[PDB]
Design a protein around this nucleic acid. Sequence first.
DNA 1: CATCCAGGTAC
DNA 2: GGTACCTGGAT
Lengths: 258, 259
Amino acid sequence: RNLVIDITKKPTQNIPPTNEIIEEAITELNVDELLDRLFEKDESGEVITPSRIAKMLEEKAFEIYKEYEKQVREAYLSAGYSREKLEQSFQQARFSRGGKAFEIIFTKLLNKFGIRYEHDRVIKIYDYITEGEKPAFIIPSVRTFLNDPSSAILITVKRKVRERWREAVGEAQILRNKFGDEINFWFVGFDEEFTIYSAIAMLDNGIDRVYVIDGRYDSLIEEIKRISDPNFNEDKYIQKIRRFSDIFDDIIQFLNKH
Amino acid sequence: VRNLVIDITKKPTQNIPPTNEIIEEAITELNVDELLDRLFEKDESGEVITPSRIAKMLEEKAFEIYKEYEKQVREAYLSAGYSREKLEQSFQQARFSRGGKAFEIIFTKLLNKFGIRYEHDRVIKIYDYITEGEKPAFIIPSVRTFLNDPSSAILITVKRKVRERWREAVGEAQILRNKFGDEINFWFVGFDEEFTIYSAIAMLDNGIDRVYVIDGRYDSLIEEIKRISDPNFNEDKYIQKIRRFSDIFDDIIQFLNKH
DNA sequence: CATCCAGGTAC
DNA sequence: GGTACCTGGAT
């Protein structure tokens, strides 16, 4: 509940960090005990899947966030702060934190599955430029990637995707250009409106697997199945498009093979 | 700006005149047609009238007009008791979309002035079996010409502020190169004073032929490049392919004259 | 519908 | 400190 507000700070700096809010959400939803029953039925009769857990956590975290946002809004308006700037700040916070929340939830799932990873580490492309490529996750480590890219997984994760899936194509290209075509680059989106073209385009242009929010999987696969063309390798796309829920065991499977 | 008739039963932003209209208003207000007549000549103040300066000035004026309209709409919706959070979100979303569109429109105005034929809104189909495809902001001179001979056309991707979204262009370029081969001409234009050296270099090494930067950033960007002291870095290779925004118009002219 | 990001926030 | 986020609607 009640935040200490410091109005000398940018309003959103008064809002607890996303990791804290996720931890709050995890505690409030009893997610750890829920995670102990992954792939079993919950009391409502739904299978406890990583995608459902992620969605529930992302919603609860947002609710908690919104409470904090309200507190900050009220404080800052009481201080005379521009409403327009405040709302802009909040929207920008929501974008950043919405993404971060999903990323953090992803790591909580990696952790549960005992998957070794490194997060937001920069893969240098030019040794003389500090800036490089920063997959969301490198599994198991950047060391393993650099020594044998075929043995590591690079995962980029996005919540809503819009046209931004092309960023993943670009990242994959930069990395493939440097490290060769043996890298493994997986895309995760968490977007019910994820498009067939984006999936096929990615899979044809340097992305090895595409993971979709579970609720989009069936309809997406049905769209793929409606296509008929000798140059359309339907089975390739069907195999390489996966439910979000499957990624964790897929990673384990991969590591066991590589 | 005019006093809008605001219908509060519409989405708030549907009461704001479209970007094309605002740009035309700005053009009139700034007498941009007279500025364009004086392109590459000195103005009264002493500064050369460049495409980038006209673009920036026009962009800023259109934004100012937009904001005046936004304020009118805001006041009307607040009087109606409309959700402030939703209103402001809607306006931010309008500003993102409109700010991009405004830059693209401004770019076309410059293209027109130079007699550069172009098409905008053309989808380059990638698959026979999907209608969706790649959508450069501009294809010069036309998508038919591109498809006839990809080497003979220029694909131009245009962004205002860039952030990480430059990788979209690398993505687009890869998709197009995969389909059409490496003889395509794919140019990136950013209108971003914070455009980064990494983005320029990575783009140029990864399917972007030419990178155009808002004029104000060109010098400092090149200086950063020059300050890479590792002798294994071949600055010349990159510097030649990084250009000021203002240069793109003559570059297109010279390209078309050659092709 | 796909693309914009008149863009600040967050780690 | 510098880059990636888009708990995202408008266009």
